[PDB]
Design a protein around this nucleic acid. Structure first.
Length: 928
RNA sequence: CAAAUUGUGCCCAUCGUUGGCACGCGUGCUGGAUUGCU
DNA sequence: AGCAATCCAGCACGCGAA
């Protein structure tokens, strides 16, 4: 029985200066009262002590010491009342409190790093005594009241809802103090302030409790018997990480070094004579060169191992073994990581004041039916583009409540649930008058006017479905400055069902046109593959393409990648003519009439970045170009950009260009603060902010649109077959230090988990759908519907191509794959066996195939493709599409007989999507 | 309780043919990544 | 090393009722 919430981010319309100021005063009164509740509950939590929690004592694994520590020892900003405690003196302070010494959990909690510059530990027990003294209440009575609170779940862990706390709760003195500090007791305002004060309290408390649990569990996984070895290895300063020595290649490096050392030792033992020092120096130089070459080789696929660390380890080769060295270094890295995990501070939340109907600040959108009643009782057009919400505002001047009306202007909200049926869908056909009105609106209001008129026409034509209002919408009024941002939240109920019938996987690639693929559960037709025991059938499989209808064409935002420059010729010609004045194969290599516009823009950004690096002293002179390249120009990043990964790469290189521009314009040593660069060129900083906001909007739109396409396909399959299952990838632990910096940057824009969260949220809104995450391990190579049934297949990937388009790089890669060399990667073995199968298919005589004269090889391939009546030839490729699948899983796959199997050349992405599906289908369907 | 001029936005070589399209908002802290000159 | 920013993700609660 799952549920979620929707929100339409309405916009407040000023009703009148007096009413607006009244609402602002009410908001300020509520906001200023929240910190009082925050401090009061800080004191209450500080008051906790043993003999109070020793009642029900209900808790999973939380030790009483950890609970007490969190209840009276928290990290808060330096500038706050409870100041006066240092980290060192935590153990004795806890010992004094409750009369017991710290335990492991409490010691770890106290032994938790934080940011001393901004935050600091706070006693949270002198605050309780301060509350007792200032309000002069007996400690016994306060203890009784707070024990009652805890018995009511009003303090500690797992607090009850704020409204319940306020309703349930020496009460006279507490209420008098609240009245002195906060306004008169009113349930709504008190509940709102208590909620907005407790939120950070309980949130950070639970987060830090689970953080301590994780830290103790991680430390229990630390061996600690390498601690002397850790100190030996550790003997400016930085932590040592496993990637600094080639975590896995260090064993081979040390084996080679041990062999060389054995040779050196046996040669020194014999041939005992002078000049030994020269040979030893020659031995040291050779080992140093070997270490450097090893680091150079290892730095091609990961971070380059540190040369100095390896030299230090090799010098101490007799005092520690290779496995001991690895254990010590991993122990040091793990200890450093565990000891830098900050504890979560407790900052004060900015109140939001959720206005509702049941138990919140009373308020409501009036109704559509009551809106019609109001428009009929009072002469009105009966149709308007605004929503009136009645809010029970507390008058600051006269301390009494009063209901006022305020206007919201969200067209989407009207389109979705508000506008009435007086008389996912499409759009109606407008009349003459409505079209004239749309054409008469100003340029900036044309789109919203068009939407409003289309909605009005839909109402006129009975094309607006009845929306069963229900009146269960929550209003969230947040006052930041002098303006409001009402939201109009709403609940959505799903009642999820487990009896699925389809599995709709999607690979969510980065740069290879993320695709989807569906699989039936109990198919009964021509093709029913018995995977293990469940009859399944490939339903279909296609790419996630979003259609933007230009005047006559239809572009794909996710993959358009820009125009091909065949129509942007004047811009490129002007840029070339201007640049010719100052001194070009690279320029022409990117200016082809088939090159995409965004690729050209990215390459130009990188070229300008390099030039500015070269011409560091004159970075300002190019600033105009940057503007003409990013905002002002018609062919600019802000004016023209798609959602394809190439576009995000272009934006990232633009941000890097701005960064290097600031660095070169502000270099002659105090740090270059953002303020200094802003003052040096406020226009450039404003442009950078504009790019950042544009990219944030760009990424949110991409997540939204991809989620829309996949969820719409899921809905289609549900309409056809039944409850669908998406099974999206669990892209976790990505962007590791072990990977190269370029790889980390490339994976950052993956947005795989963002898309997964968005589609999960959407699926929470549609009945029947559900989204689960499965392990992406080996999902990119398994052959669909045949892997795992007899056993794992793990076939390799190819790339079909004609002989005429064969390149030297392809031949070199193929020959390298043909090289029978031992490799630890299972992918290398898979590609080796695939290449062996390819050779056996046509008998290329690998020994005779690795010769020169690539033209001769092309001629031989053409002869082979002539003997066998085909069109192209396949060849293994590590980054190639066209995975070999046994079934026709594409609908465009080509049947080809490889050996005796009659495979279907599908596309790698579609088979990957299929693999992502049915990974744990048995878990989905139990025999019950 | 009347402003009837804007929810956030997204797409484009010819910004309109009424162009096409999407969307949970906030707050808070915690982990990985973007230049720069030795 | 002789130090300025920001983005991508991860969890904590409001969006109870009777």
């Amino acid at each position: 029985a799952s549920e979620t919430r929707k929100a339409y981010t309405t916009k407040m319309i000023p009703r009148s200066h007096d009413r607006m100021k009244l609402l602002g005063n009410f908001m300020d009164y509520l906001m200023d009262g929240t910190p009082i509740f925050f401090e009061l509950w800080n004191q209450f939590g500080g008051g906790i002590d043993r003999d109070i929690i020793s009642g029900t004592a209900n808790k999973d694994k939380i030790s009483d010491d950890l609970l007490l520590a969190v209840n009276w020892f928290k990290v808060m900003p330096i500038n706050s009342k409870p100041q006066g405690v240092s980290p060192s003196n935590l153990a004795n302070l806890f010992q004094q409190y409750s009369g017991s010494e710290p335990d492991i959990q409490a010691q770890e909690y106290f032994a938790s790093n934080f940011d001393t510059e901004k935050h600091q530990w706070k006693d949270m027990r002198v605050e309780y005594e301060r509350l007792l003294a200032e309000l002069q209440l007996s400690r016994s009575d306060m203890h009784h009241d707070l024990k009652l609170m805890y018995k009511e779940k009003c303090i500690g862990l797992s607090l009850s809802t704020a409204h319940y706390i306020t309703s349930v709760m020496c009460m006279e003195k507490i209420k008098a103090f609240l009245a002195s500090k906060v306004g008169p007791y009113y349930l709504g305002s008190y509940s709102a302030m208590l909620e907005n004060a407790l939120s950070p309290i309980k949130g950070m408390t639970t987060k830090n409790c689970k953080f301590v649990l994780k830290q103790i569990d991680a430390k229990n996984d630390i061996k600690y018997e390498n601690e002397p070895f850790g100190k030996i290895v550790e003997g400016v300063k930085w932590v040592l990480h496993p990637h600094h020595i080639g975590e896995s290649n260090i064993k081979t490096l040390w084996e080679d070094l041990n062999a060389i050392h054995s040779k050196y030792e046996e040669d020194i033992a014999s041939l005992s004579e002078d000049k030994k020092e020269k040979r030893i120096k020659v031995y040291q130089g050779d080992v140093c060169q070997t270490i450097n070459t090893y680091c150079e080789e290892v730095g091609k696929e990961a971070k380059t191992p540190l040369v100095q660390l390896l030299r230090y380890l090799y010098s101490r080769k007799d005092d520690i073994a290779v496995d001991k060295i690895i254990d010590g270094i991993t122990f040091l890295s793990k200890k450093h990581k565990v000891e830098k995990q900050k504890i979560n501070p407790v900052i004060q939340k900015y109140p939001s004041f959720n206005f509702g109907n049941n138990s919140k600040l009373l308020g409501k959108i009036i109704s559509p039916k009551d809106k019609l009643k109001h428009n009929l009782k009072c002469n009105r057009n009966q149709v308007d583009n605004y929503i009136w919400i009645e809010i029970k505002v507390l008058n600051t001047k006269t301390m009494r409540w009063e209901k006022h009306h305020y206007a919201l202007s969200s067209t989407r909200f009207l389109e979705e649930v508000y506008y009435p049926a007086t008389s996912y869908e499409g759009k109606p056909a407008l009349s003459a008058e409505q079209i004239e009105q749309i054409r008469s609106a100003p340029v900036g209001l044309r789109k919203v006017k068009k939407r409003q008129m289309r909605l009005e026409a839909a109402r006129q034509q009975n094309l607006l479905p009845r929306y069963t209002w229900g009146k269960d919408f929550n209003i969230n009024i947040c006052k930041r400055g002098n303006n409001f941002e009402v939201t109009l939240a709403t609940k959505v109920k799903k009642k999820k069902e487990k009896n699925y019938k389809v599995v709709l996987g999607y690979d969510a690639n980065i740069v290879r046109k993320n695709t989807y693929a569906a699989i039936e559960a109990h198919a009964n037709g021509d093709g029913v593959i018995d995977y293990n025991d469940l009859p399944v059938k490939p339903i279909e499989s296609g790419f996630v393409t979003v259609e933007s209808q230009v005047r006559d064409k239809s572009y794909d935002q996710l993959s358009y990648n820009g125009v091909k420059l065949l129509y942007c010729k004047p811009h490129v010609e002007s840029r070339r003519s201007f640049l010719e004045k100052y001194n070009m194969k690279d320029f022409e290599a990117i200016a082809d009439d088939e090159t995409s516009l965004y690729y050209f823009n990215m390459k130009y950004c990188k070229l300008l970045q390099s030039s500015i690096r070269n011409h560091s002293s004159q970075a300002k002179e190019y600033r105009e170009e940057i503007f003409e390249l990013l905002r002002d120009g018609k062919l600019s990043v802000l004016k023209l950009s798609s959602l394809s990964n190439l576009s995000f790469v272009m934006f990232k290189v633009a941000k890097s260009l701005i960064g290097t521009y600031f660095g070169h314009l502000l270099k002659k040593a105090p740090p270059i603060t953002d303020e200094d660069k802003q003052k040096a060129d406020p226009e450039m900083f404003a442009l950078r902010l504009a790019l950042e906001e544009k990219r944030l909007n760009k990424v949110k739109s991409k997540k939204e649109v991809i989620a829309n396409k996949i969820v719409a396909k899921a809905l289609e399959l549900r309409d056809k077959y039944g409850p669908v299952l998406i099974k999206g990838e669990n892209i976790s632990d990505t962007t590791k230090k072990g990977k190269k910096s370029s790889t980390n940057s490339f994976l950052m824009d993956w947005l795989a988990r963002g898309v997964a969260n968005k589609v999960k949220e959407m699926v929470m809104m549609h009945q029947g759908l559900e989204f689960v995450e499965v392990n992406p391990n080996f999902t990119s190579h398994q052959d669909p519907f045949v892997h795992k049934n007899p056993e794992n297949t793990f076939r390799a990937r190819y790339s079909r191509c004609t002989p005429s388009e064969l390149t030297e790089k392809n031949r070199k890669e193929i020959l390298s794959f043909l090289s029978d060399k031992p490799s630890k990667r299972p992918t290398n073995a898979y590609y080796n066996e695939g290449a062996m199968a390819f050779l056996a298919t046509y008998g290329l005589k690998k020994n005779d195939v690795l010769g020169v004269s690539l033209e001769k090889f092309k001629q031989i391939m053409a002869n082979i493709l002539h003997q066998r009546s085909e069109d192209q030839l396949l060849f293994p490729s590590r980054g190639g599409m066209f995975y070999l699948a046994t079934y026709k899983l594409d609908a465009d796959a080509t049947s080809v007989n490889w050996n005796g199997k009659q495979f279907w050349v599908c596309n790698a992405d579609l088979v990957a999507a299929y693999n992502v599906g049915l990974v744990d289908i048995q878990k989905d369907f139990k025999k019950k």
